[model samples]
Target chain A: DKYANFSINFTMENQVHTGMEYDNGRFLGVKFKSVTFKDSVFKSCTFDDVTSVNTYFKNCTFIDTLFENTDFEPYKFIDSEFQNCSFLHNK
Target chain B: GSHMNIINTSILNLRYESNHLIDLSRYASKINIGSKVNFDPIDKNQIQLFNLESSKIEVILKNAIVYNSMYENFSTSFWIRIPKYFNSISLNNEYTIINCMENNSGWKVSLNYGEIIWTLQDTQEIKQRVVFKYSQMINISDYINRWIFVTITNNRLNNSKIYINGRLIDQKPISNLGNIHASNNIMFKLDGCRDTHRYIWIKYFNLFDKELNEKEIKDLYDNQSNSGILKDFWGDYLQYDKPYYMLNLYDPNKYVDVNNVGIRGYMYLKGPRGSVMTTNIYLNSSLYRGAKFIIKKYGNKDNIVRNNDRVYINVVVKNKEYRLATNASQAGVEKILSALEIPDVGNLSQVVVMKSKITNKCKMNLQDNNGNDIGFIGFHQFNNIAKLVASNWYNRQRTLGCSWEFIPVDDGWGERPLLV
Candidate 1:
């Protein structure tokens, strides 16, 4: 499903999302464990205090997004492009 | 390849395999030239100067010759200024800077793959060339974008030395090709034969009549900072920190009076003519109460100073002057003047004299009361003296100053009235 201007907090694991368009969306305190996202476009999205473990983003584009105080080290971005995106205070 | 007409001046003319010809006409003042006569050398290794102002003009050397009268012993030095992007302009093949050659003997100094190579050839019987490479000695890339000094000395009787930045990088015995010929020639190319175009700026090029030792080479490099070319580029940055007090005995300004101290100094020139004294002036914080002075032996063999020559240092404390004798070379005169004290504010003068017929030069350096180094005094000749007085006086009230009173000793002459 294509989601825009959406706000969601996911506590589940092993969820797969593909071809999703997320714009101006806020993912706060979300624990994404082993989540797979493919061909996703995230524009102007904010990730605050988010924790991701073994998450995969394939062929994704992130524009004007902010990742603050987040631990995304375990997350993989394959063939992804980031434009004007900022990673601040991240572990 | 396209052909172009090459014009020649009245002085010289150029021709290429009869196909391209540059003709000059002096009488008629009018001539017709071909459109496809190119005079540029096919190898692209010609002698020319690199134009600093314009990009169109490029100077390369090919078969350029520099001739000079050969000497039994000689020294040559040059200062090279490297550009920032040296790697970009580095040539693929060795860049020949100097190629000195004779009929059957010669020496060459070149840069091969960023390393300096010195080759000397002795062709008396079988042509033998000794190649000394700097790859193992120094990494030339480290000196990029800065000025580097290079010197080559051939003494004929002794081993020759190649110095880079005042350090000896290579030394080898003189070539067995017998004494150097009376006439010698040097050659270089305009542009390199390789793909990359290497260019460098040269400041000073000197050919000495006599072989210079290591100390002389080092002194030459050390003085480069004071050269006009470097001073223009670096300004005051090339100068050392100013000293607390300075007295140049060589100059007319003989006195440099700083706060609470005045110095009077003079020197006598002895030893060999044209000999220079390199002064090392510094102040030791640990030895704040006194000063240390040292002199090393220098000059040609016959005129060198031995123990026979008498050198003395004179120190003036207040108005009283004390003279002490010192050795010819490596004398410690500071111990004799150690008893002299510098009050909160006082004046002093120093003089150096040589009791020999040989002409010698003196270099002096003074310091402040805080033991900070001032600059070196200028080189001086005979009867040169430096006088200094305290510019500022200490202000404070003194109580019970020490007195120089002497206690009387009684002569035991009891009832000596009978021994009239």
Candidate 2:
């Protein structure tokens, strides 16, 4: 229901941030090998050039979001909610 | 936010695919599968092309693939460009093959009697066939010499499907009365009962023990998706249907902090057949390797770049300017990996900006041997691998167009018809 951290603009890599709250942010080239963003809240976000090897977005939430390019192969989206989301040139 | 409905996306079990794939185009030959590219597939440069009749490849695999049970899954897909001259028949034997194998069965995907057909047989020998008539594919004015992606798939539950250019064309139920076996050896192209073969061009021939989903198949047809198979190089996504515009941020004047403007990679100029040169020479040599066959229209000839023209490569690295000009006639059209010999550079390293200006071949600035201006496409900053793709292309002397997608996988994938 709530998060430990909240941000209007956000970007991350090489560090693990869990239970964070992010709203309406534009992220690019977000990637990692084996990370997890469990119980996070992200509403209305723009993700460009995102990919992962074995990442997990467990119990995360997203709405009104756009993902330009992505390939989350071998990744899991366990109980995540995404509404009005669009994937462009994504594989 | 805690409780909401979120659907899940799925992926094919790639573990069952890696070893089963037999790509005739990658690593084995020097061929450019890039889009919009036109070249003589049977050139003198040892382009590695041969007729099926010349190389009879047949393998009645020891195991049965089209099982008699209700669950036998198989799939095959390829790209074909039929020549203008060739009939689909020669007394029940003339056909261009995608593949043919047996296990008390006949699994075929080929062009027969001007019709696209998929035939499957179980060990019990019940047949299931699907055909898309030539009259059905008459959507295009000229059928010959143009590229078309042909795909076929069958799930474990006797459901088979056909697709062209990412569009589902047909589906049929496989009649499996009773029997079983492996899909047999993947017998490649060959002449039919008669001496007539379509002599067509083929690439990206893939096989899977497991069925591929619509998106996976579409990504194959699209060719640029990072489905872990093919990597999209610089300029790989440039559309040739029309003229393209560039952002001012790509120019060196605005984005290239001269003090911070430094070379972290190598740049190459692909000339003669093609007008594309890249700075990010980023190639996926580990996964799939290839050669680029570019076609340049010269003196009124369409899509025919003369072999005699010199290939003057422009290199921009941590050193001084580098330019080398050699006749492509010696080797014919080739991929740069080992042929062009512009070694060790990141594949997309040369792209300075999109829509670069070609000022009647300027030898003073970063120009090719033909005096073609090589405007900066963009650059890569090294401190942390940050790329500054500033719009560095000059607006004068435009020649068709160019891309920043880097080493486009298929030769003409970044094709921009020369209007010079």
Candidate 3:
């Protein structure tokens, strides 16, 4: 649940991470301080719903992914963006 | 608490400022504000405040597409706001929009073709001097095959410019002379012109303001990279009409033979005098064709008595043959019919001939379906009733068909002679 300063590498096989805790349970929550996610995809995963802004996703193929009614205010998308990502009617 | 040695990185702990815990887990855990933006860094020992500008965004796509409202429409939709001070923007080499009319009130989007920029709405009228500027010179002829859409809004107090594909083209001082403010109510003129006829497509348009900063102008042009709107417009406008030949009057009598040419017994004709006979068939080369004639037996008495008492006959035909077809059948006389062939003939009289030279080469061989060459009567020979009939035939041939059209013949005989 709580992953701090953890590094993860995804290769040929698609790596699935759901609700991966970034900063620990203290005043500071889960954070991928020193991590790189290679050719991989993320599915229906929620970054902490709390007001803890600053979440970073490195070079990863977010192919045909869905981000449903997710609030993008507090979250920061840096260094990378999505390609051909669609917003479907039913998602 | 342990003293963490700070290296080349500075990290500020946000826990000290607010009561809420920094749940980096729920949010994006890491953020890298490149070296150029050093004020805010994400190091272990230091943290800084996050602002909208801190995450300066740059989106680069070799190919980006935005569809229209429909499934395959690909129409672009977006809103951009530029400061009033910005001056000029260019739509590459496609087009340019300088400034729209502030006082005119009328909405205008001028495509570089035709005479006027298409007009939109009826109430907007030009009162004082309100001029829109276009510094970029465009050849209207070059975009003859392309359709463009432009939306101009004088929504702001002191700014006006063109918008193509949802971005501004050029910059111009937006004067609040009319005190026009931003309203959700925006009107679009297709083909950059307002008219009763609405345009389905457009290419480039100008949206500018006098005070827009240089950075804002550049950003406006940089963002307009799609051309789907023009394509949709062109497709709809082009498919909107269907693609017809006239009958030649000359080819009217193409079916019958020479013996049957005259309009009388078998539809032959006699040539008339002092009249111009023209071929129904007109050749591109020659204007002079031949004439035609109609012959009928006149008077109630059917039998011919003597040269003085001959049966009165009426002959109607074209006068002359000014134009002739330049073909192999240069022969002046082509068909003839014999009067002796009539059911009952007693005494025969001198015959008359009408002539013309305006007949087209038969489109098809004139033989019957069995391939027998069709025979036509000729003038110049005669026999008894055979001689009389043959003589009449020869005379008929002299002026039959389109070649030997009809010549009018009148006799001076009255109704009845006194038998005293």
- TM-score of the B chain in each candidate versus the native B chain: 0.36, 0.42, 0.20
Per-residue lDDT tens digits of candidate 2, residues A1-91? 3432222223344556578777766566766667778778766666667777667888877654555556753237777765434443346
Q: Which runs in model 3 stand beyond 4 Å of their true positions?
A: A1-91, B1-142, B145-159, B162-178, B181-184, B187-198, B202-220, B226-420
By TM-score, the better pick of 2 and 3 is 2
Model 3 per-residue lDDT tens digits across residues B110-145: 333222122222122322222223321221111222
Per-candidate TM equals 0.32, 0.36, 0.18
Which model is ahead, 1 or 3, in terms of DockQ?
Answer: 1
lDDT for A46 (candidate 2) = 66
Interface RMSD value for candidate 1, one decimal? 42.7
Model 1 chain B — which ten-residue stretch has the worst lDDT?
B411-420
- Report per-prediction Cα RMSD to one decimal: 26.4, 22.2, 40.7
Model 2 scores a TM of 0.36
Candidate 2 lDDT tens digits, B77-169: 656554433222332454546455444464777655445778776567677777765531221112333456777888756577888766788
Q: Interface RMSD (Å), each candidate?
A: 42.7, 16.3, 44.7
Error of 1 at B80 (Å): 1.3
DockQ of each: 0.01, 0.01, 0.00
- Clashes, model 2: 59
Q: Is the docking of candidate 3 incorrect, acceptable, medium or high quality?
A: incorrect
